[PDB]
Amino acid sequence: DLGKKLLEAAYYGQLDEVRILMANGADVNAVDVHGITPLHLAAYFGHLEIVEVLLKTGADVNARDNRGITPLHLAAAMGHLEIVEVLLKAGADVNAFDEAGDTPLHLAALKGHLEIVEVLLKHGADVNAQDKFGKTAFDISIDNGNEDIAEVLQKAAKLN
Amino acid sequence: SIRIGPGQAFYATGDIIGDI
Ligand SMILES: [Mg+2]
Ligand SMILES: [Mg+2]
User: Which residue ranges make up each domain of chain A?
Assistant: First the structure.
């Protein structure tokens, strides 16, 4: 019951309740039948303070759901730069591959987030990683017409 | 449904999140 309440607290930005539930023994690594953890939900919905509290209390920064999606994948796709930075500082795998072969860099390129792309690159994101469709992050930025992101990915590749 | 190509695993997780 505490784990379900913790998932819901993360979903709805219930920071104070997150603290209370974990003081009362809730598993910070509670996981639903889809593989989704409180940290995934806080990352997806942009709840930065909840991300921080969960990490402080032992959340697995690299939890994969049943599709191989990590909290970093979700924060990168949803445009939450500070969360991206916090997750990386806590040891998030910058080049985690989901079941489609997409990395956080692929998703940040897919959703056109320039500074998130840049931070991922500064932390070692792999410009040569291909997803299961043969696409690198650069290919995605070409496909979606984002010239600024394509330029920074091409620069990164040239200087590797 | 979810279209086949880049992002499909992300979108599938997003859909599941949307049903919680
Ligand atoms: Mg920006
Ligand atoms: Mg739905």
Answer: 1-160
